[PDB]
Amino acid sequence: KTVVVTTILESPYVMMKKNHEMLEGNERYEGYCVDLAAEIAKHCGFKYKLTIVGDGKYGARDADTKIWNGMVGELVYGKADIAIAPLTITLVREEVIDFSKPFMSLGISIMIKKPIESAEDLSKQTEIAYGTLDSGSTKEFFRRSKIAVFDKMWTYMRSAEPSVFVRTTAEGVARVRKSKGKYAYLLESTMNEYIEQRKPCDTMKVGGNLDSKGYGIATPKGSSLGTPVNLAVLKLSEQGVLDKLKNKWWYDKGEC
Amino acid sequence: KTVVVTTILESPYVMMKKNHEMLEGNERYEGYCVDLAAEIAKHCGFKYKLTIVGDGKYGARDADTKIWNGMVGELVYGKADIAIAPLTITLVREEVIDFSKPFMSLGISIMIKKPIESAEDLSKQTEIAYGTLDSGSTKEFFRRSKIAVFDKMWTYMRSAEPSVFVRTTAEGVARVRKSKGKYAYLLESTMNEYIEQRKPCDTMKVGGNLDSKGYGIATPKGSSLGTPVNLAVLKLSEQGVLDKLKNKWWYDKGEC
Amino acid sequence: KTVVVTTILESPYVMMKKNHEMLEGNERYEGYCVDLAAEIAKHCGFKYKLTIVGDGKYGARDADTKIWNGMVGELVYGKADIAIAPLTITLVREEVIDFSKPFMSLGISIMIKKPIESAEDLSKQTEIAYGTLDSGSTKEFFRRSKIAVFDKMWTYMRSAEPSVFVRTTAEGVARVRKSKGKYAYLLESTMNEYIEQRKPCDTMKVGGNLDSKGYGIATPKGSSLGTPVNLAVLKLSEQGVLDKLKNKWWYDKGEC
Amino acid sequence: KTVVVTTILESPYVMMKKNHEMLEGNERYEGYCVDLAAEIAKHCGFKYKLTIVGDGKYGARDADTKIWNGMVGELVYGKADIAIAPLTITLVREEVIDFSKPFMSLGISIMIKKPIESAEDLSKQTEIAYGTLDSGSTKEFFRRSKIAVFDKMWTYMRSAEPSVFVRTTAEGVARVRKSKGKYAYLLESTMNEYIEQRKPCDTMKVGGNLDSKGYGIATPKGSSLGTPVNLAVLKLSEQGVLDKLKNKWWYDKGEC
Ligand SMILES: NS(=O)(=O)c1cc2c(cc1Cl)N[C@H]([C@H]1C[C@H]3C=C[C@@H]1C3)NS2(=O)=O
Ligand SMILES: NS(=O)(=O)c1cc2c(cc1Cl)N[C@H]([C@H]1C[C@H]3C=C[C@@H]1C3)NS2(=O)=O
Ligand SMILES: NS(=O)(=O)c1cc2c(cc1Cl)N[C@H]([C@H]1C[C@H]3C=C[C@@H]1C3)NS2(=O)=O
Ligand SMILES: NS(=O)(=O)c1cc2c(cc1Cl)N[C@H]([C@H]1C[C@H]3C=C[C@@H]1C3)NS2(=O)=O
Ligand SMILES: NCc1cc2[nH]c(=O)c(=O)[nH]c2cc1[N+](=O)[O-]
Ligand SMILES: NCc1cc2[nH]c(=O)c(=O)[nH]c2cc1[N+](=O)[O-]
Ligand SMILES: NCc1cc2[nH]c(=O)c(=O)[nH]c2cc1[N+](=O)[O-]
Ligand SMILES: NCc1cc2[nH]c(=O)c(=O)[nH]c2cc1[N+](=O)[O-]
């Protein structure tokens, strides 16, 4: 039986090809996650079909009806057999599905207009503003923080005029590019570097990751693909395959 | 029942108390892993007894007799119920034992005396020598690496005189401090930062991580502790506790 | 029973929530004294309701009818059970009501626009004018002062033109910000620091405190709350809670 | 009946006169506390006899025997009717004896040789050393402290070579004087100022008080001298008498 691989459209993980309208099957898509799916299938030996999640969400549960949307919902309700996507490994998600070892390491990073080379410097000064997404995991991390630096950041951002929070990541990047060095954006390190390697190459990632997270390949609880996929990720990590794929899709196809 | 925790003596993970002669039980030890064990036991609501691994080794499979030693041996042969230590998540270990999600991220870094800011700069120049251990993860990573930069680094190291390889990290740091800016050490980033934060403060860490690894909490295969321990690790990571413990034993206790 | 906690509307002690219309009860208020009331009630384990004093006055005795107004009136005439507010510990108030040990220390300081580093520096020179409230504790302190510096300051202020006395605190701060370094304001050190930590940040605090005063928690005479409240104040001061609460509402929420 | 006033020999509060062996009665002693006792007696209209505490201690429980020593024990066991001394208002003492409102404000301050202004700066730099007494309430303040600055200074102090903690305060000021700018002393603000005003006038108090404490007049619990002495202290504070006595014994009799 062929294995359904649910995933999401997000550059450079999964992207729609230039000549995709004429293509069919798995050839309509390309990216880091497509190559990762190919490597996992080669390691384990199964035939797979790539499918994009219908609602285009990573996955969350509502306190009202206790239902999961997105790829986590697709996994828990039997619609998909495996999720190969930039899905963050969280406790709430891990309670309902099985996560492999993280195949990519990320964290919260600072985006500026290409000095302030760390988070504490940005917190101290008020000359350069900084913002976060209007609603997201990074925003909740800032909200529920204990360290003094992040507490000061959150007290500043929550009570600030104009609203430094931004609806969507694209609007935040646009704000950073417009503000001619006045506004800094806080976001995931992987997306930060991806945008930094995009035209017109006017943004730069500065400093280190504020926290540490990871992306995992998720399977339903009690699935037969859990253990073999976990060993596949570890094998690809020690072989340097995962390092090669990140270099290819972030830098070899970069534009700077 | 009292769960036996197998552990190795490593700084700042598990060091002897300054007055361990006047103490008995788990009060004899302190460090990062002692606090981690305390929090893991608090989450799962059980009592434990810390035990230092007698062989003093992390764990590997014998080439001929196929017998594991170290904490991996203790878990495989039922001499312990958990291994709360900086145990690297690898493939063969994952095949014999169970690993949790990585509670700390590490990679190969460069140690220089307090001109070189990256591995590319290190490879291009020949003024400064550099090497790794005589045998271990770093040397095997450089031996099998197909990437051009690390391939060039390895072919330099193999054909360099005097020999750039050292017998143990202690003599590696010693040779770094004695060469007076004429030697770089390729070691784990955690040990790099720790030695950086020690007196007399004559070493620094340059560049990013060459690869990416992780330390995980090990548990015997088929144990009932694996899932609660994994959830405890995820909860501690999301609450910022692991952020605090790393900063405490690396920077707050630092002498620089 | 429910304990009535009379309070005054003063910043940053008790101020309205940014969206107090949507809220009700004790969640409708915020500030230093709200947190202090929460901790005091937690120590003594009682239920409380925050009520703003209707007259909007701290409390004084009428020289004609000998009737107290404000929160001192509420405590004397049995309209409240406790007064958790910046109430100054004075002689007549101590004669009518009971005060705890001072939970915060304050004095008379100098407010200048961001040449003078002490009160005697103000006294010796004449270029910069300075004054106090037209009616209040500071003017009376300067009036009946036998110390040479304070006596010289007072005899300058009395025989000065244009008049150096302001109607209220807001007018004094405004006159400080409308003189371009040609006017100094003599006010309480707590209000000095507060206005210093607010936008547009064009005022500073120079020199030490001219005298010593304290804010105390006031309880009705012959009540069972006095001794536990005094012990609670002492315990909170010894634990550093009072140090933290001032830092939060003065500096951690500052705008400079 | 004459009132017994227990005191402690401590400059400038209580001191022995140059011609004391010739004199008898209350004339054997002079200082800030002697003048304060005179003012309190005049306000309350009683005659008093000044006595020095036999063991020369302020007061502390001995946990094994549960017996108070010093002037606190003198008051508890009926030996003395009032204590007029630099007795800190603490939680443990307040439960057992009665304290008036504080007549003097003090705190922990930094003593240098006349570089660094504030305590956070001292914490950051490791060039200048600093340490408190081998015992006393300053170490207890530092240990219980949860703020990052004071906690990090405490962790520096605990693990420090050579031992920066000092046996006695005189040895501490001697070490500061001999250290020629290398060692800073942390102690009470009042004693800091007193030593600053004495020959050879080489030490200087710098920065601000780290915490806030106070000295109070102590009376046995449930005694008729409580409220009158409290009112006397308040009246003397509002009359400026306490300011005058502080100036007289710290500066008017200073030597710098
Ligand atoms: N450089 S990267 O973000 O593409 C990246 C990140 C990571 C990789 C591999 C790569 Cl290539 N493997 C590690 C894995 C190895 C073992 C230790 C942690 C997991 C299990 N996780 S990681 O630290 O999240
Ligand atoms: N010691 S550390 O600050 O570098 C550090 C490192 C890591 C942390 C948490 C911390 Cl505090 N959690 C992550 C975990 C979170 C979820 C995603 C990857 C694992 C599962 N692993 S990690 O990337 O190895
Ligand atoms: N830093 S502050 O003004 O908020 C402040 C001021 C003071 C505090 C505590 C704080 Cl946090 N406690 C002291 C108390 C402690 C004991 C000695 C005097 C009173 C009883 N009073 S204080 O010296 O008036
Ligand atoms: N300048 S000083 O240390 O001699 C000093 C310190 C203080 C004085 C008076 C003087 Cl002179 N009175 C105040 C008192 C006044 C009222 C408010 C707090 C107590 C009751 N306490 S204090 O703030 O501890
Ligand atoms: N960077 C990819 C990406 C991955 C995500 N994974 C998640 O589990 C999630 O809850 N939100 C994410 C947002 C993004 N994003 O668009 O920044
Ligand atoms: N704690 C550092 C450290 C951790 C290790 N963990 C392992 O699982 C391992 O096989 N070898 C290690 C060597 C070292 N080392 O000596 O740098
Ligand atoms: N700083 C708070 C503040 C506290 C006060 N307490 C009093 O007991 C009082 O009689 N007058 C006060 C004025 C002020 N003020 O300056 O607004
Ligand atoms: N008068 C100063 C002083 C006053 C003190 N009051 C106290 O209640 C105490 O327990 N210890 C003290 C030590 C000192 N000291 O540093 O000599």
Side-chain angles (χ1 to χ4, degrees), chain A residues 2-17 19-149 151-256, chain B residues 2-17 19-46 48-256, chain C residues 2-17 19-149 151-256, chain D residues 2-17 19-46 48-256:
Chain A
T2 72
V3 176
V4 183
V5 182
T6 182
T7 181
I8 201 174
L9 277 177
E10 188 100 60
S11 299
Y13 311 95
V14 179
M15 293 157 330
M16 210 81 198
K17 277 193 187 167
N19 58 313
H20 75 275
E21 49 289 69
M22 101 177 300
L23 293 160
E24 72 193 359
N26 303 347
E27 272 84 72
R28 305 202 298 295
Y29 320 95
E30 61 163 3
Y32 180 99
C33 276
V34 176
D35 306 325
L36 189 48
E39 303 279 2
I40 300 303
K42 194 197 85 191
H43 169 274
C44 295
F46 54 79
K47 206 199 109 52
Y48 64 98
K49 151 160 152 314
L50 285 168
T51 305
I52 307 295
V53 54
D55 46 302
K57 323 195 98 62
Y58 288 94
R61 99 171 328 170
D62 44 4
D64 203 80
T65 38
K66 308 277 107 172
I67 75 103
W68 290 87
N69 53 15
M71 320 187 256
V72 188
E74 280 215 14
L75 284 174
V76 296
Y77 300 144
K79 312 150 142 282
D81 281 294
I82 186 173
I84 301 176
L87 195 64
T88 312
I89 297 164
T90 58
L91 170 96
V92 46
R93 274 184 190 129
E94 246 280 20
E95 286 154 4
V96 304
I97 48 169
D98 271 343
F99 266 119
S100 86
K101 302 285 121 162
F103 65 84
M104 211 187 273
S105 294
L106 68 145
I108 291 173
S109 63
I110 313 144
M111 179 190 252
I112 52 149
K113 176 76 172 3
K114 83 193 281 280
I116 307 278
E117 305 304 287
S118 273
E120 218 266 340
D121 320 55
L122 210 62
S123 147
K124 286 187 305 251
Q125 58 93 35
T126 52
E127 295 280 336
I128 308 304
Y130 45 88
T132 313
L133 209 54
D134 207 5
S135 48
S137 63
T138 159
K139 168 126 160 202
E140 319 295 20
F141 160 84
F142 279 126
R143 153 139 35 239
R144 200 181 62 245
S145 188
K146 196 261 296 176
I147 310 184
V149 182
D151 271 340
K152 189 75 175 298
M153 300 211 158
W154 177 237
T155 48
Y156 169 114
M157 289 189 263
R158 185 187 64 211
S159 304
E161 310 278 326
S163 71
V164 274
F165 301 122
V166 153
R167 293 201 74 240
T168 175
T169 278
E171 284 181 19
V173 168
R175 204 156 152 184
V176 157
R177 294 170 152 155
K178 274 172 208 153
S179 288
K180 56 202 65 61
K182 190 74 164 166
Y183 175 66
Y185 198 65
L186 298 147
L187 77 167
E188 290 127 337
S189 81
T190 55
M191 186 68 157
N192 202 353
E193 303 160 332
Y194 182 73
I195 299 295
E196 144 168 315
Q197 222 68 23
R198 288 294 113 183
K199 287 311 213 341
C201 318
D202 44 328
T203 56
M204 181 163 218
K205 168 187 187 287
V206 47
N209 289 342
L210 305 194
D211 59 330
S212 283
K213 298 185 300 294
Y215 294 147
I217 290 164
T219 51
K221 271 251 179 304
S223 173
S224 60
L225 280 168
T227 315
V229 160
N230 190 71
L231 296 167
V233 165
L234 293 195
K235 151 162 299 315
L236 295 170
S237 191
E238 304 179 4
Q239 270 201 357
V241 184
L242 295 180
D243 269 329
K244 181 184 76 71
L245 281 182
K246 205 206 150 67
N247 204 66
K248 165 185 171 191
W249 289 101
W250 266 257
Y251 305 113
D252 284 359
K253 294 172 178 285
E255 301 167 328
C256 321
Chain B
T2 89
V3 152
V4 176
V5 186
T6 183
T7 291
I8 203 169
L9 272 177
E10 189 77 38
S11 294
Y13 307 102
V14 199
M15 326 151 277
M16 269 328 176
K17 266 263 171 101
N19 47 73
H20 78 269
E21 315 86 316
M22 269 210 291
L23 291 162
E24 201 31 86
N26 305 343
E27 301 307 293
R28 269 167 316 152
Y29 319 98
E30 90 271 56
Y32 182 95
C33 289
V34 170
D35 295 44
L36 186 54
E39 312 254 347
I40 293 289
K42 184 209 316 309
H43 170 274
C44 295
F46 75 109
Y48 64 100
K49 190 239 316 163
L50 274 145
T51 316
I52 303 302
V53 52
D55 251 346
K57 289 158 217 193
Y58 282 94
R61 193 209 290 291
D62 188 5
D64 48 357
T65 48
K66 303 244 209 273
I67 322 194
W68 295 83
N69 49 293
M71 326 178 246
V72 186
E74 321 293 337
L75 300 165
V76 165
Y77 311 127
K79 295 309 113 174
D81 298 289
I82 211 184
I84 301 165
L87 195 53
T88 304
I89 309 176
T90 69
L91 182 48
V92 285
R93 287 179 183 163
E94 189 77 76
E95 268 159 14
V96 278
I97 59 166
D98 273 346
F99 273 108
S100 86
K101 297 295 185 288
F103 61 87
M104 180 163 84
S105 266
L106 65 137
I108 295 151
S109 57
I110 305 150
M111 169 170 275
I112 60 149
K113 190 180 186 295
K114 205 139 63 197
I116 292 303
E117 202 91 49
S118 99
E120 326 157 5
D121 309 1
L122 210 52
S123 84
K124 291 178 178 69
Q125 64 97 66
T126 190
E127 154 80 83
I128 295 171
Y130 53 87
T132 73
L133 271 158
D134 283 6
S135 46
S137 42
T138 316
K139 202 196 198 182
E140 299 291 5
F141 165 82
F142 277 107
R143 172 123 65 82
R144 84 196 137 191
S145 186
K146 74 101 165 163
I147 305 166
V149 187
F150 307 135
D151 191 12
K152 162 170 230 265
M153 269 168 108
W154 168 243
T155 168
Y156 156 47
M157 272 186 273
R158 187 180 65 197
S159 298
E161 279 297 328
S163 167
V164 299
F165 302 119
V166 294
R167 291 120 298 121
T168 308
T169 165
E171 301 110 308
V173 177
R175 197 249 200 73
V176 157
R177 302 163 150 175
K178 299 209 193 141
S179 286
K180 196 163 73 173
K182 257 73 201 141
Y183 188 78
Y185 193 39
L186 289 155
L187 81 167
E188 278 101 335
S189 61
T190 55
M191 204 31 87
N192 214 19
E193 283 140 16
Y194 180 66
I195 300 305
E196 178 174 33
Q197 229 75 16
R198 300 287 102 188
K199 283 188 175 70
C201 317
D202 57 333
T203 49
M204 58 178 341
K205 173 186 180 292
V206 282
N209 284 330
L210 307 191
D211 68 340
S212 152
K213 295 192 298 300
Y215 289 143
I217 288 162
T219 308
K221 186 75 70 69
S223 168
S224 85
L225 272 171
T227 296
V229 159
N230 194 84
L231 291 184
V233 167
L234 272 180
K235 160 142 281 295
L236 286 195
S237 172
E238 247 166 293
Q239 263 36 58
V241 179
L242 296 179
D243 272 30
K244 187 217 310 162
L245 291 173
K246 174 82 186 298
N247 175 62
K248 161 192 201 193
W249 292 101
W250 265 259
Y251 304 109
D252 284 348
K253 297 219 154 62
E255 324 169 321
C256 303
Chain C
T2 281
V3 173
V4 182
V5 184
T6 178
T7 45
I8 195 45
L9 268 181
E10 194 71 64
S11 317
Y13 309 101
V14 197
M15 47 217 184
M16 271 329 175
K17 267 270 188 60
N19 50 316
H20 78 269
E21 279 287 343
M22 297 220 265
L23 319 151
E24 262 284 348
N26 301 356
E27 300 312 284
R28 194 162 21 118
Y29 308 100
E30 50 163 352
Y32 180 96
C33 285
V34 173
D35 298 34
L36 185 56
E39 311 251 344
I40 290 293
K42 183 209 324 295
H43 170 273
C44 300
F46 63 89
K47 292 319 148 90
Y48 68 102
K49 179 185 73 174
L50 277 151
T51 84
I52 305 303
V53 50
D55 251 345
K57 289 158 218 203
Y58 284 94
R61 186 209 298 291
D62 186 15
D64 314 70
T65 37
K66 300 241 209 284
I67 325 190
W68 295 81
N69 49 301
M71 335 165 69
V72 186
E74 318 297 337
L75 297 171
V76 162
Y77 310 126
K79 278 161 273 152
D81 316 318
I82 195 174
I84 300 164
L87 194 53
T88 311
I89 306 170
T90 66
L91 183 48
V92 288
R93 284 179 184 164
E94 189 74 10
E95 280 173 349
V96 278
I97 66 183
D98 270 346
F99 270 111
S100 73
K101 298 295 185 284
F103 61 87
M104 173 165 89
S105 268
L106 69 138
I108 296 158
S109 54
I110 304 108
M111 169 170 273
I112 59 148
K113 193 183 186 298
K114 206 138 47 191
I116 296 296
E117 207 94 46
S118 71
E120 71 220 19
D121 277 50
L122 274 177
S123 73
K124 292 173 184 292
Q125 69 75 84
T126 187
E127 145 163 310
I128 304 184
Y130 50 89
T132 80
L133 277 308
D134 189 55
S135 66
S137 79
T138 320
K139 190 175 180 177
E140 303 286 5
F141 164 81
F142 277 106
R143 167 121 64 91
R144 49 191 284 275
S145 194
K146 293 286 188 172
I147 307 166
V149 181
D151 194 9
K152 191 170 193 294
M153 286 176 84
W154 167 242
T155 178
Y156 158 46
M157 275 186 271
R158 193 185 353 113
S159 69
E161 198 62 31
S163 196
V164 298
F165 304 117
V166 299
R167 325 95 174 279
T168 50
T169 315
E171 274 109 305
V173 175
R175 184 173 175 178
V176 158
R177 305 166 146 165
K178 295 202 212 163
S179 299
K180 202 167 285 191
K182 264 22 162 173
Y183 186 69
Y185 194 37
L186 286 147
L187 82 167
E188 278 101 341
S189 66
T190 45
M191 205 32 86
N192 212 15
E193 281 138 15
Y194 189 60
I195 301 305
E196 184 180 32
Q197 227 75 15
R198 305 255 78 69
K199 293 234 183 64
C201 321
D202 60 337
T203 51
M204 58 178 341
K205 169 186 185 290
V206 284
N209 283 327
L210 301 194
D211 66 340
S212 279
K213 285 189 302 303
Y215 289 143
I217 288 160
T219 20
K221 197 89 97 186
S223 84
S224 80
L225 273 169
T227 294
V229 154
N230 194 83
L231 290 186
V233 166
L234 265 181
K235 156 142 280 297
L236 285 190
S237 95
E238 214 143 329
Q239 265 32 66
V241 181
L242 292 183
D243 288 344
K244 187 221 305 162
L245 283 174
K246 184 166 190 293
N247 171 337
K248 166 188 174 184
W249 292 99
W250 265 258
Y251 303 112
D252 277 345
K253 277 193 210 296
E255 318 168 318
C256 323
Chain D
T2 75
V3 174
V4 183
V5 183
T6 174
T7 40
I8 190 166
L9 277 176
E10 187 103 58
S11 302
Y13 311 95
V14 184
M15 291 145 20
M16 213 82 198
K17 283 190 185 165
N19 58 320
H20 72 95
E21 61 295 41
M22 155 141 72
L23 303 159
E24 296 277 354
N26 296 346
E27 276 88 72
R28 297 204 302 299
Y29 319 93
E30 76 180 339
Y32 179 100
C33 276
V34 175
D35 307 322
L36 187 53
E39 308 270 8
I40 298 298
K42 138 171 52 162
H43 168 279
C44 295
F46 65 88
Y48 63 100
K49 161 96 217 193
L50 279 168
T51 48
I52 307 298
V53 57
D55 46 299
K57 315 206 102 73
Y58 288 99
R61 274 183 178 175
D62 158 58
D64 322 78
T65 326
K66 275 331 179 62
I67 297 299
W68 289 90
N69 55 9
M71 323 183 252
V72 187
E74 283 247 26
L75 297 157
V76 171
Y77 305 136
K79 309 149 153 263
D81 280 302
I82 188 171
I84 299 170
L87 195 54
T88 312
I89 300 170
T90 55
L91 176 56
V92 284
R93 293 176 168 143
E94 187 52 288
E95 292 154 3
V96 169
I97 53 174
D98 261 353
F99 271 114
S100 86
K101 294 298 180 290
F103 65 84
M104 212 187 270
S105 299
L106 69 148
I108 292 172
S109 61
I110 308 141
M111 179 187 246
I112 64 182
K113 166 82 170 13
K114 89 171 179 68
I116 276 75
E117 202 263 350
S118 286
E120 212 269 330
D121 307 333
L122 216 62
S123 66
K124 279 182 173 178
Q125 59 90 35
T126 181
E127 193 64 65
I128 289 98
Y130 56 100
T132 67
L133 262 171
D134 230 350
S135 48
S137 61
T138 53
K139 307 223 289 143
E140 328 299 18
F141 164 75
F142 276 129
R143 183 182 295 110
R144 290 298 300 114
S145 196
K146 323 286 217 53
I147 314 302
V149 187
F150 306 149
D151 219 356
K152 89 175 135 197
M153 323 192 330
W154 163 243
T155 65
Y156 169 114
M157 263 166 249
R158 168 210 274 114
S159 298
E161 307 278 328
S163 182
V164 290
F165 299 120
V166 193
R167 170 69 70 188
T168 189
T169 282
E171 282 199 354
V173 62
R175 165 129 44 119
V176 160
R177 275 164 172 151
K178 292 180 179 70
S179 204
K180 57 182 70 64
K182 180 70 170 171
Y183 174 80
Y185 199 56
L186 297 143
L187 77 167
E188 286 128 344
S189 75
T190 49
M191 187 71 157
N192 220 359
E193 275 135 31
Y194 185 71
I195 301 298
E196 207 185 23
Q197 293 302 115
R198 299 256 86 69
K199 305 295 241 322
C201 312
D202 42 325
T203 36
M204 182 162 213
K205 171 177 151 26
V206 54
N209 292 350
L210 304 194
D211 60 329
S212 281
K213 286 153 326 208
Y215 297 146
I217 306 298
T219 297
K221 179 154 305 300
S223 170
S224 56
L225 272 184
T227 88
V229 162
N230 191 62
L231 289 175
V233 163
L234 293 198
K235 148 166 300 314
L236 289 161
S237 196
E238 271 164 274
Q239 259 196 4
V241 187
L242 295 180
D243 276 334
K244 183 180 74 69
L245 284 180
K246 175 80 177 293
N247 200 66
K248 164 184 186 205
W249 289 99
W250 265 258
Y251 306 109
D252 289 19
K253 293 180 181 284
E255 293 159 354
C256 320

